[PDB]
DNA sequence: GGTTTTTCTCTTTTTCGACCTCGAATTCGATTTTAGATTTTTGG
């Protein structure tokens, strides 16, 4: 790297809130297939 | 009258209590800008 510049984050970054979910249904066993990914 | 056996309590274990208690994770209402429109006022 010959020329280095620090830049602010939100200048080059699109932030968006989640698309609306109702994913709290009655059974979501391993027979199903989506990856439910949390912290 | 004495000895032995059985039982009862007291000493020590031991196993339960529509629980409970710490880490991890977090959905709805409360509240705010912006999009936008409509109405009113001022200027030409």
From Swiss-Prot:
Superkingdom of source: Bacteria
Family, as annotated: Belongs to the type-I restriction system S methylase family.
Subunit structure: The type I restriction/modification system is composed of three polypeptides R, M and S; the restriction enzyme has stoichiometry R(2)M(2)S(1) while the methyltransferase is M(2)S(1). There is an equilibrium between R(2)M(2)S(1) and R(1)M(2)S(1); the latter is methylation and translocation proficient but restriction deficient. (Microbial infection) Holoenenzyme interacts with Escherichia phage T7 protein Ocr; this interaction leads to the inhibition of the restriction activity, but may still allow methylation and translocation.
Record function comment: The specificity (S) subunit of a type I restriction enzyme; this subunit dictates DNA sequence specificity. The presence or absence of a 4-residue repeat changes the sequence specificity; a third copy of TAEL inserted at position 179-180 changes the recognition site from 5'-GAAN(6)RTCG-3' (for EcoR124I) to 5'-GAAN(7)RTCG-3' (for EcoR124II).
Description of its domains: Contains two DNA recognition domains (TRD), each specifying recognition of one of the two defined components of the target sequence.
Other known facts: Type I restriction and modification enzymes are complex, multifunctional systems which require ATP, S-adenosyl methionine and Mg(2+) as cofactors and, in addition to their endonucleolytic and methylase activities, are potent DNA-dependent ATPases. The presence or absence of a 4-amino acid repeat changes the sequence specificity; a third copy of TAEL inserted at position 179-180 changes the recognition site from 5'-GAAN(6)RTCG-3' (EcoR124I) to 5'-GAAN(7)RTCG-3' (EcoR124II). The shorter protein is also known as Type I specificity subunit S.EcoR124I.
Protein name (Swiss-Prot/TrEMBL): Type I restriction enzyme EcoR124I/EcoR124II specificity subunit
Organism: Escherichia coli
Gene from which this protein is expressed: hsdS
First-to-last residue of the parent protein present: 13 to 51 of 404
């Amino acid at each position: 790297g010959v020329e280095v510049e620090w830049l602010p984050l939100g200048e080059i970054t699109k932030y968006e809130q989640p698309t609306k979910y109702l994913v709290k249904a009655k059974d979501y066993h391993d027979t199903y297939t989506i990856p439910v990914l949390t912290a």
